[PDB]
Structures are given as C-alpha cells and as structure tokens.
C-alpha cells in the first residue's frame, strides 16, 4: 500500500484536512496525520479539535511517504511555512521525486521552502498574491492543478477533487472512480 503524510498545524482548515484524510483512507492509502507541534490535539481554524496519529517528529522517522499533504488555512499554512522540519521533509520529497500535494493557503508553504519553482500552481484566490511574490510559479485558476509532482487545489469546495487527484496519482484512475461513486459528488 501507498502511504501519505498529512502535516497538521494549529490553524489548519479542518475541511481541507479531513476530506483528504478520509478519501485517501477510502482508497486504501495508509495515512499518517502528523502533528507539527507534537502529538497533542490540534485546534483547527474553525475550532474543530483533531487528535493526530503521531507527532511530526516521530512520523518523519517512518518515511518516506508516497505523498506529503499540506492542508490550508491561512494560519496553519503560516505555521507550515515557518517550520524547519517541514522544509526538510519537502526538500527530501522533491529530491526523491515523490508527490507533494497542497490546498488553499497550503501551497504558500511551498514558496516559503523553495519547493517546485517553475510549476503551474493554484491556490485559494486570497492566497494568490502571497504565492506569486517573486514570480516563482505560474498561476492557474483550475480547481485542481498538477504539474509533475506538484499537485495543488483551491479551497474547501475543491477538496474532494484534490483528494481524488491524489488517489488517482497513487492508486490509479479506476480506484479513484470507485472511491468517488459512494461520495455522491455533483
């Protein structure tokens, strides 16, 4: 089975977080929800409190992972952007040609860590200016954008599409289709 690392910081967007975790687990991916700050519960942007599976400190010793996922939430993404551990994980994932997936404000952590420059990317509309500072990416308004191993998406409303794109990349089109049907998507 393929493995996913989802990095969960205070202020993460809980919808951004939970939809990909749940959909990936439906696809038979082994998902580790790793707390940036440790194994304690994390207070998300809209006050949902999620207990991580592990600390990031521990989960990073159990890699490598087939995908590293960066949820959104403006203040969660800020925390991701400021973390040396996140920098190291992303650099190592990029160097081994592993998938990196980020949604909403999450892609701005790619900018902070100098990951995937030159890629076509999307973000939440309100995160475009931050992402584009310095012109290091080319912007897209597609709901999901994938340029090689950099997969990005826009917001809570695009999170199913994002999650299913991760599933397709790791486990193929047929598994994505199978997982999609019972979700009752429009």
């Amino acid at each position: 089975s393929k493995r996913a690392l989802v990095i969960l910081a205070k202020g993460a967007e809980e919808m951004d977080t939970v939809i990909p975790v749940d959909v990936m687990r439906r696809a038979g991916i082994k998902v580790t929800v790793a707390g940036l700050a440790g194994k304690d519960p994390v207070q998300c942007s809209r006050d949902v409190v999620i207990c991580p599976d592990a600390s990031l400190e521990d989960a990073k010793k159990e890699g490598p992972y087939d995908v590293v996922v960066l949820p959104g939430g403006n203040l969660g993404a800020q925390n991701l952007s400021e973390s040396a551990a996140v920098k190291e994980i992303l650099k190592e994932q990029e160097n081994r040609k592993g998938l990196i997936a980020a949604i909403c404000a999450g892609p701005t952590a790619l900018l902070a860590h100098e990951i995937g420059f030159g890629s076509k990317v999307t973000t939440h509309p309100l995160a475009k200016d931050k992402m584009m500072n310095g012109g290091h990416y080319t912007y897209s308004e597609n709901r999901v954008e994938k340029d090689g191993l950099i997969l990005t998406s826009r917001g809570p409303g695009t999170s199913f599409e994002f999650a299913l794109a991760i599933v397709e990349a790791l486990n193929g089109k047929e598994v994505a289709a199978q997982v999609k049907a019972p979700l009752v998507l429009k």
Copy 2:
C-alpha cells in the same frame, strides 16, 4: 446568534461532521459539538479523532438549540438511533418546531426515534432501504431535501449544500451566499 447542536458518536462520518460544523461557524452560528458518549475524543469512521466541545449530557442542559444536526456514518447513525438521550432531544426539538438536520445515514436515526413521519426525505443511497422500512417517509433523490423542519441530505459530496441549507434556514439567503463564495464551490 443562532445555536446548533451537532451530536457526535463513535463511527460518525468525519466529513459529514466537520463540513457542517465549519460552515455553520463561518455563518456566525454558535456550534456545540457534543459527544454522545461523553467529553472524550471520538473515533470517526475513517479514524479521524475529534475532541468534542462538551458531552451530550452537558450540552443538552444548555439548550434549546435552533438546529440539531445528525451526521452520517452507518455506525455513528446506529449509535444515534440507540440513544435515549438522542430520542428525547429530537422529540423536544420537533415539539418546539425547531429544525432537525441529518445527512447520509443520519436520517435513519429519525426513523428510530419516530421523528418527522410523513416528511419527504433523502439519505445516502445505501441507507434508503433502512429509512424506508415501514413506509413512514416519502423518498427523494434530491441532493438536499427540506420538508418544513426536517432537512436531509445524501453524502459527503452533498455536505456543503446541506450545511449551506442549514445556514439559509437559520441566518438567511444573503448570509448563505456570503459564506459560500470563499469556499470555491462548483
């Protein structure tokens, strides 16, 4: 401000749970995530662990609420269906002409507690047979169904629509529209 009670049981569908909580909080609704079994963390269907705001035992003493929300998840809905506390809360909400909102397998708890008989309802497709046992409701395949004070919806993929229908019912069309735009919905 309007107030929402979201009843969280082991085996609840975490997407079903978190999307309505988050969207309602975006709408300025005061949401209480109440643990059916107590204030301890709840293991959802796809293993996301959510810490409730309160036990149901405590939250039911702080009502009444403008909406009672029943998430899905087949095994969460079973727990809701088996709870005397849930029966009492729903009966009292129905008697005071308060909104009751249920998604996915969640509406089957309405059947268990004899709530809203004669209403037009939807469920997840796989929950239709259970919901329809005895012919006490009329079935719909609409993504969101509202018949007076019984609001139902189908699955994770309809959870934004469900949540925005709750917002519209409590806080009006304009607030729902305002909350919807930043979600990046299709």
